[PDB]
Amino acid sequence: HPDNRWYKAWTMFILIWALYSSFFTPLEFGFFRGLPENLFILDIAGQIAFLVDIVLTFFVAYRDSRTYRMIYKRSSIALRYLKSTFIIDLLACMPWDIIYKAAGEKEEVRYLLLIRLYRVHRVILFFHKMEKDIRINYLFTRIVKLIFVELYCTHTAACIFYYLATTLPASQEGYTWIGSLKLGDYSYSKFREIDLWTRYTTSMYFAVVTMATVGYGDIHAVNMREMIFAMVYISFDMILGAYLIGNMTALIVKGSKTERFRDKMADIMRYMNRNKLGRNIRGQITGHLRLQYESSYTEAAVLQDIPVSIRAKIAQTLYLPYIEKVPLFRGCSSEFINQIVIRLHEEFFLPGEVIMEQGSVVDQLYFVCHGVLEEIGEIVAVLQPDHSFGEISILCNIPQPYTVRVAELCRILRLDKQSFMNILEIFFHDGRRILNNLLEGKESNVR
Amino acid sequence: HPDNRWYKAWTMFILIWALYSSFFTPLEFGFFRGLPENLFILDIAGQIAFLVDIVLTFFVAYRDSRTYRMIYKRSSIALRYLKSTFIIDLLACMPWDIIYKAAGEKEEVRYLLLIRLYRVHRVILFFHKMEKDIRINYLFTRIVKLIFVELYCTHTAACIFYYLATTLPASQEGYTWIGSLKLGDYSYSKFREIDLWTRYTTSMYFAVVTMATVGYGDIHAVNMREMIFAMVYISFDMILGAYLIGNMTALIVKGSKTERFRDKMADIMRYMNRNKLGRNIRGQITGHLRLQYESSYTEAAVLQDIPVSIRAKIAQTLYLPYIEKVPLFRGCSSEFINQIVIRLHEEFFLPGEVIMEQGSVVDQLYFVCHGVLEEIGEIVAVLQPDHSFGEISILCNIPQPYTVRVAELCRILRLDKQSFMNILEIFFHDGRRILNNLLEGK
Amino acid sequence: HPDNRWYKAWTMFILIWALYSSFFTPLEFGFFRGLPENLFILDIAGQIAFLVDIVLTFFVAYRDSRTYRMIYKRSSIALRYLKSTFIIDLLACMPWDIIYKAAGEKEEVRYLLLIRLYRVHRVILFFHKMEKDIRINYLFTRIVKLIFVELYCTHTAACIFYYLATTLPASQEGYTWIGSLKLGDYSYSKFREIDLWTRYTTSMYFAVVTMATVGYGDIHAVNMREMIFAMVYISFDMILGAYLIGNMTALIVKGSKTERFRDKMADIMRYMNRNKLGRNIRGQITGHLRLQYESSYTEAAVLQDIPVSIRAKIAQTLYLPYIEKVPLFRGCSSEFINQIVIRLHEEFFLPGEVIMEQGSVVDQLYFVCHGVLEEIGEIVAVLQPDHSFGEISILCNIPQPYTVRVAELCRILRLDKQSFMNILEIFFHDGRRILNNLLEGKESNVR
Amino acid sequence: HPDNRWYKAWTMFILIWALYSSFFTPLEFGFFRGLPENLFILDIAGQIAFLVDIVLTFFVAYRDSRTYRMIYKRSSIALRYLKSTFIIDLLACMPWDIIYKAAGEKEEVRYLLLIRLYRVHRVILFFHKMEKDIRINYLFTRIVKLIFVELYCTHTAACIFYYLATTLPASQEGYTWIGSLKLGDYSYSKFREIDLWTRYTTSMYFAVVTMATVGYGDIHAVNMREMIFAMVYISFDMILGAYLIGNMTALIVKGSKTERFRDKMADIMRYMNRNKLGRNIRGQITGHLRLQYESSYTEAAVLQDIPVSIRAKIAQTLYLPYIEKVPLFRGCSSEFINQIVIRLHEEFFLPGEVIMEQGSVVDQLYFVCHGVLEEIGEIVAVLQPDHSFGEISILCNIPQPYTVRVAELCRILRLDKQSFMNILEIFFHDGRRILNNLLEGK
Structure with a gap:
């Protein structure tokens, strides 16, 4: 009911039935006037399994696009289904085999078995849902999806081409695509008396060969009915064939970032x-x-587009432990740190790179979380994690006297200039303790 | 004349007529030496209909690319057409079937009926026009245009496939592609006596099969005439077939979708x-x-393309009615509201999320466009659209006592803390009214 | 000799001969043991035309990639050709027809006619040179080039497939692809006695049908020789066929900027x-x-990558007339203007846009060349072409008191702040006249 | 062991052996019930050769992705192989032809000879390794890999195409694809008696034709066994055929060339x-x-990818020897030259161009790497490589009296006017040496 684990198992169960019912229906439609008593039980289970799905869907949750909520009210739940493809589900669930025999073996009733071809869209939904999964390779799931649509449209075409051969009386077998078919020493003289799997394989062989545009020509359309469907099937498959090439080509041009x-x-x-x-x-x-x-990492960061409230929580979860340990903010209010942790951006520096030079104006504040830096004036001071540098350039407005060089790979947090004073002027009281801590450490002698 | 609705229906009625005359001219050229009396009335209607279009084109509008303006002067409209593809349309309107029978049944005269194939360009122009529609992707329209062109070229090839078989005498039927044809039991011994819809289906079956490069070989080019045209049609099809694949890939490449x-x-x-x-x-x-x-994302769009001057107008058109209804801005000046409206940003919140918590200082001001929220302290107050929240922390500098949780999906407009004081500092009198409104409600 | 107009006409003349000699050679090789007396004269003219090209190339100029110069020294000119495909040109120019008859109608000598297939590369060069032309659509010239390679490889394959049928004696005609070919009522019983254009059309029909992978199967490989070449030709054409699809697909994905x-x-x-x-x-x-x-225009500008010396000439040719007419630089030295004209970038403003606001710090200097602007404080002053604004924000360091709005479409020249003072401090004498001109105009009362 | 040159030739000699055993195993499986005595010595060499490779793999190196280091410990190398695809290699090395004849000529035993098809993966690994080469485009290598795979799969399909015809008794030859075959006059009545290279060519002709989807139909799947495998092979080929087209387009899309x-x-x-x-x-x-x-452009490259710290090292490696030979910097300190080298930019000049003119003030300093120039006042002085010009305007602030025209294509290093004074102002003593060098030469 809440779309829990039990419902997901059923959607996998009916998906197996959807694969069977979508594949078996054209075979039932074309190669069978009426199912033998052996297959009577098999279809009863299939319709019952889909009949239970009709009741279960009345109890399934309701997903509405505009509001993005799971609404559990029964009255709204039923309503949606009734307008949205409930008649087709009932129509496909009706026993069209039993009605066909009951009505008097009337073939126009048997044309209504083809509404069970809608059940292949259930498999298509599972392929679309598979695309949403991050783990599964997109090229793989867009190839299997278009190799199943091609396979299904080929299986259907193979079963309708055989039906068009049975639309004539057995006396006119010579004017069909199969009754006039001789392959090697085998002659399909009376094709209705051949076993089912020879007829299907011969029909499916023709459809597959047509599907890939191989076109041997050993099996071809003879009748006017078969020619018309062949033109319809070939024209449709040509568009479908170009879609498979187009999709595979598009997923190769859009190569991996590696x-x-x-x-x-x-x-x-x-x-x-x-x-x-x-x-x-x-x-x-x-x-x-x-x-x-x-840096391809920091770009994902910049994109973000997540609400700032969540992005603030990301800033608070990661950078708060590092900022609280710096001697610069000793005794500062936690609220002041909270407005600080939001505005840093993560920048990575390789070993051997030059961060700063002698007497150069500074446009960014840097905090060290990973690695070791060197202040060269000879190494004036070796920088550890949670040790910040460049505070002289900000509070005093004197450029850093010591060049900064990277010894080991460093995860450095970047803070912009004009952002920092904006917080400083807002919290003027917090500014004093920052300067008082600087006075205690000395090593600057500038204010 | 002014490209009004009647003229937009005239060019939509001729398109219906153009589709008929584009698909019937090869059928008349190939399978018909002379049209029967029954089809005489049908074709004479189409030729007359295209004659009226010729007259109407003299009276329509004149579009010039350089000036991008419609010049309604009659003399300007006339000179353009007669120089630009008017002789072809006039030639196509000639009763070429009547002239064929009157001239003495000369097949050379009937060869010139193929100039009516230019009317597919009118159908092509509609497809090019349909590319301009914003609702339908311009690359999906090109897919349909090439599908139609391949369908049309296959139909034209089928009628020329059959015509080359009729260029030989009936005594040389066995040297044709259809005269020597034998599909199953049926033998196309005397194909000229076969019904029309069996000859066309056989010809279109041959044309369709090679259009997709299936090539069964049950129907093939027996004669030297058919071998040359099969090579020409196949070579042209191969270029056109790769065009569809190229446009299919461009559609998938561009429309990345998921x-x-x-x-x-x-x-x-x-x-x-x-x-x-x-x-x-x-x-x-x-x-x-x-x-x-x-739902496809709007912040992404706005960034995607605007300067600041009219981005305010976009904000003014979209956000002003909701901001004006906020009780906080009751009695505030329009300019104070106008400058505020510029700096809003939109955030969507999924149901079940938590925006603020107990004793948490926030630096953003929130106005709700849609959805329903609840202040949790128990629900302190259910938030209606146009009911702002967060003013307590922004103004009084005290964290919100309550959490505003989301139960209904909401469109929320965000105003930053630092931006708001700058507006209050400039419009200090407007800020006083805000304080008075806050005092009245509390 | 300098590759003047006369040489270019010859390259077009030999290109016509290259099209003939590349097309006619496989037809001569496969469908002809020895050319009749009618075609004796035609080949003599063809070889003579290419023989003259051998002498003319000894007189053509010399294009060397590393140095990019036209060197006219004869000794270096002949040296390059001799190592670079001069033997092949001589070998293709030799009368292999006359040698074939003279040697005693020996077919191994006639295999050496196929070195004239190198002459199709001359046509390929003309297609490559056509691609270099800006006017010709790239998609068009990359389609004709790959529809001529496909056509040529199909014409060659059509002429070698017929040759493989003639490699057997006439008694074994039934074991060939053509001697065992019956189409309709026509039977190719004695294919060597049929007229040439029926044999070529039948062969070319087979090759074209194979080229597009239509594969009717009415004409197919019967011999072991024909099967091996069919596998070789099909495999090569499959790679070539995928190249045509790939090239056409790539030129559609890379769509026009429109x-x-x-x-x-x-x-x-x-x-x-x-x-x-x-x-x-x-x-x-x-x-x-x-x-x-x-702006897609200003981006081309930024790219530029042309040497600064030429880019300076571009700056001097366009912006010098506009800068000299401004009242700001009245009496300034032309050298000072010369260092000015280099550093402006062109920016376009639409009507109704807001350039400036009240009391806002300025980071760019603007000059007006096209259109009319309004200084709103009410319009304080309507701006004409060659009238500059924002000088107060630069020389005085006071933000512009008047907002600037665009009335008509404007071509505005942009000058950066720190660039302008750099010239000002270098030419301190030129700074005085700029301030003196500002004093004369008044309307500022600030220095 | 250390992936030395001998091991790089061993894995290059097995690749030669792998190509033989990948292309001969289907040929042996399909057309041969039992190998003749003549080919016994050939296959026993290949099986022995792959047995040595199994032993050598235990002694080679061990590459771990996580540590990116080669662990030379013998026990570490051994455990990896036996878990990772060692049983397949050992199984492939078994004398499956000898076991076939010894077991009693059972075709079920011979069915397992197809595990030798894994040796194409060794050829595939070489193609994947060749992708890493910088000289050969990694997308052109994928083109060859798919061409080889299609060539290999077609060869494998051809041998399985013939095998399915041998699964029927000779009495049922007419129900096979080859037994019922009749090409021209030749009838494949008793195909088992036909020579080997006619059966393989016929089988490969069938396999090649459908690989490109030509489908002549002269050779087709008569039996139900062949119909199923033709459908399977065609369906797999259709996916693989579109892979080649996709990789062809990606090559053209990426390699834009002109x-x-x-x-x-x-x-x-x-x-x-x-x-x-x-x-x-x-x-x-x-x-x-x-x-x-x-010549493909270098400035574009350098921009394309560097920070400033090592961009100086790139400049130092490339420009320092030419700058050090300039007579102007004679006696100058290394640090003064080192800081100069960082700020050079490269410009190429086509012959016939004019750089400066009479009485023209220039703001760039030029050092010539290649080419020959001429000062025109008549040629005042022909400029040799490592002979700088433009110092007169930069230092003395007087425009060049002469024009430096180009007769030979030159690589020119550019130093800006404003940058140079900053270097002179800091290194004032170095600037004095520059003046002394200028005075000595003039």
């Missing part, structure tokens, strides 16, 4: 090998391109 | 397996991405 | 029609997207 | 038809774009 990385990566080797060499230069631009792959 | 959702979930996964985020926050963000692809 | 504009353009109507309406709003975002198309 | 030049000439044309630029400047820029696509 291959897009390789395109840029291999091109840069083309740019150095024709110009220079080096065990270190070649091994350092590779590091730089893997750092561009690490 | 690929735009699959790729976003891949980047979001990377951002969220490197951070060890808990399952509770795991579900919240993922559900938002699920919502962003079901 | 269609890319339409994709963004149509999407924005989807974003307003579902939200709001308006005769003006809808008609103003269209203006904004056509302004984004006008 | 499209990168056509698109640039289109944007440059727009920038230059809206400006009424003269023909003389028209040719100069167009020729530069022609040069930019002939």
Whole structure:
């Protein structure tokens, strides 16, 4: 009822029945005037299984697109189904076999078995739901989906082509696609007396060969009925065939991000090998391109487009432990830190890179969470995690006297200038303790 | 004349007539030496109908690409047509079936009936016009145009396939593609005596089969005349067949559909397996991405394309009526509201989410467009659309005592904390009215 | 000799001969043991025309990739050709027909006629040169090029398939692809006695049908020789066939910039029609997207990558007349203007847009070349072409008191702040006359 | 063991052996009930050769994806193989032809010879490895891999096509695809007595024809066994056929080749038809774009991907030897030269161009890497590589008296005017040496 685990099992159970009922119906329609007593029980179970699905759907939840909620009211639940393809489900569930024999073996009633072909859309829904899964490769599930539609449309065409051969009396077998078919020493002289699986394989062989446009021509349309359907089936399959090529081509042009990385990566080797060499230069631009792959991370970050309330929770969950441990904010109010943790952006620096230089104006505040940095003036001070630098450039407005270089791979948190003062002027009281902590540490002697 | 509704129905009625005359001219050219008396009245109606269109084109409008304006001057409209494809239309309107019989049943005269094939271009122009429709994708329209062209070219090829078999005398029937045909028991010994809809179906079966490159070989080009045209038709079809595949791929490449959702979930996964985020926050963000692809996302659109000057007008058209109904802005000046409206941003909240909590300071002001919310302290107050919340934290600088939870999907307009004080500081008198309205309600 | 107009005519003349010699050689190879006396003269003219090309190439210029120059020295000119496919040109020019009859009608000598198939590469070069032309649509010339390669490979395969039928004696005609071919009432009983154009059309019909993978099967490979070539030809054509589909697909996915504009353009109507309406709003975002198309112009500009010396000449040719007419630079040295004209970037503003506001810091200098602007404080001053505004924000460092609005479509030249002072401090003398001109105009009263 | 050159030749010699055993196993399975004595020595060599490879794999290296390091420990290498596809290789090495004859000529035993088809994966691994090569495009390698796979699958299908005809007794030859075959005069009445290379060619002709979906129909699936496998092979081929088309398009889409030049000439044309630029400047820029696509452009590359710290190292590796040889920097400190080297930019000049003119002030400093230039005042001085020019205007602030024209294509390093004074102002002592060097030369 809430679409729990039990309902999901049923949707998998009916999906198996949907695969059977969609495949068996054209075989029943074309190759069988009336099902033998052996298959009487098999169809009874199939209709009963779908009949139970009709009752279960009356108890299923209701998913409405505009409001995005699970509404449990029964009156609204029934209403939706009745307008939305409930007659077709009842019509496909009716015993069209029993009515066919009861009515007097009238073939126009048996044309109504083809409404059970709607049950293949249930399998199509399962393929669409499989596409929504992140784990399953998109190219794989868009190939199986279009190799099942091609297979199903081929199975249906194979069963209707045989039916068009049975639309004539047995005296006119020579004017059919099968009664006039001789393959090797075998002659399909009386095709209605041949066993079922020879007729189906011969029909399915013709449809598959037509489906891939191989077209041997050993089996071909002879009648005017068969020619018209062949034109209809070929024209439809040609559009369907171009869709399979188009979908597979589109999923290869839209290659994985790893291959897009390789395109840029291999091109840069083309740019150095024709110009220079080096065990270190070649091994350092590779590091730089893997750092561009690490930035492919910060871009997801920027996109985000999640409400700021959740994004604030992301900022609070990750960066709050690191910010609270810095000596800069010793004694500061937790609220002031809360407005701080929101506005940092994560930037990664490779070992050997130069963060700062001597006497250069600073536009960003940096906090260290991972790795070791060096302040070179000789290493003035080795930077540990939770140790911030560049505070002199912000509070004092004097450029950093010491150049900053990266010794090990670092996860550095970036804070912008104009953002920082905006918080500072709003919380002027919190500004004093920041300066008081700086006074205690000394090493600056500037205010 | 002015491209009014009648002229938009005239060019829609000729399109119906053009479809008939495009699909009947090859049928008349191939399978008919002379039209029967019964079909005489039908074709004479179509030829007359296209004659009226010729007259109406002289009176319609004149569109010039350079000026992008319709010049209604009669002399300007006339000169254009006679220079641009008017002789072809006049030639097509000639009673070429009547002239055929009057000239002495000369097949050379009947060869020129094929100029009526230009009327498919009128159908093509409709497909090009349908490309301009915003509702229907311009790449799905090209799919239908090539499907129709392949359907039309196959139909034209089928009628020329049969005509080449009629170019030989009946004594040389065995040297044709249809005269030597024997499908099953049926033998096309004297095909000229066979009924029309069996010859066309056989010819169209041959044309359709090679159009998809199936090539059964039951029907093939026996004669040297048919071999050449089969090569020409196949070669042209091969180019046209690859055009459909190219346009099919371009449709899938452009209309990524769920690929735009699959790729976003891949980047979001990377951002969220490197951070060890808990399952509770795991579900919240993922559900938002699920919502962003079901109803197709508007913030993305607005960014996608505007400067600030008219982005305010977009905000003014969309957000002003809801902001004006807020009790907080009761008695406030229009300019104060107008400048506020510019800076709103829209956020959608899935049901079950929590916006604020107990004793939590928030830096955003929220106005609800749709949905129903509830203040939880028990439900303190159910929030109606146009009932703002969050003013307590923004103005009084005290965290919200209650949590505003979501039970109905809501469209929420966001105004930042820092932006709001700047508006209050400038429009200080308007801020005083806000305080008075807050005092009246509390 | 300098590759003048006369040489270009010859390259078009030999191209006609290349089309003939490439098409006629397989027809000569397969369908002819020895050319009749009627075609004796025709081949003599063909070889003579290519023989003259051998001498002319010894006099043509020399294009070397590394140095990009036309070197006229004869000794270097002949050297290049001799190593680069001169033997093949001589070999294809030799009278292999006359040698074939002279040697004693030996068929192994006639296998050497196929080196004249290299002459189709001359046509391929003309197709590659056509691609370099800007005017010709790229999709068109990449379709004709791959429809000529397919046509040529089909013409060649049609002429070699017939040859494989003649490799057997006439007594074994029944074991060939043509001697055992009956189509309708016509029987190819003695195919060597049939007229040439029936044999070629039958062979070319088979190759075209195989080329498009239609495969009727009326004409098929019977011998072991014909089967092996059919496998070789089909496998090669399958790769070639997928290249034609791939090239046509790639040139449709890479659509024109107009269609890319339409994709963004149509999407924005989807974003307003579902939200709001308006005769003006809808008609103003269209203006904004056509302004984004006008910026597609400034992006070409930014790319540029032309040496700065030429780009300086572009700046001097266009913006110098407009800059000299401004009252701001009255009496300034031409050299100072020369360093000015380089650094402006062209930006376009639509009517109704807001350029400036009251009391806002300015980061760019603007000059007006086209259109009319309004200074609203009421219109303080209507701006004409060659009238600059924002000078107060630069020289005085006071924000513009008047908002700037666009009345008519304007071509506005943009100058950056830090760039302008850099020139000002370098030419301090030129700074005085700029301030003196500002003093004369008054309307500012600030320095 | 260490993935040395011998092991890189061993895995290149087995690849030769793998190609033989991948293409001979279906041939042995289909057309051979039992191998003749002559081919016994050939196959016993291949099976022995693959047995040595099994032993060598235990002694080779062990590559782990997580650590990206080669673990040379013998026990670590052993455990990996036996768990990962070792039983298949051992099973393939079994003398399945000898066991077939010894067991009593049971076709069920011979059915398991098809596990030797796994050796194509070794060939596939080589194609995947060849994708990593920078010289050969990774998308052109995928083209060859699918061409080989289609060639291999067609070869495998041909041998299974013939095998299904041998599953029927010789009395039921007419019910097979080959027994009922009659091509021209030749009748495949008793195909088992036909020579090997006529049966394989007939089988491969059938397999090749349907691989490209040509489908002549001269050879087709007569039996029910062949109908099923034809459907299976055709269905698998249809997926594989569209894979080649998809990879063909991706190659053309990615390798735009001249499209990168056509698109640039289109944007440059727009920038230059809206400006009424003269023909003389028209040719100069167009020729530069022609040069930019002939030798493939390096400035574009460097931008494409570097930070500043190692972009200096790229400049230091490439430009330092040429800068150090400049007579202007004679006696200058290394640090002064090192900081200069960072700020050079490269410009290529087509022959015939003019760089400066009479009395023209320029703001760039030029060092020539390649080519030959000439100062025109008559040629004042022919410029050799490593001979800088433009110092007169940069230092003395006087426009160049002479024009430096280009007669040889030159690679020119550019240093800006404003950048150079900042270097001179900081390294003032180095600037004095520059003045002394200028005085010595003049």
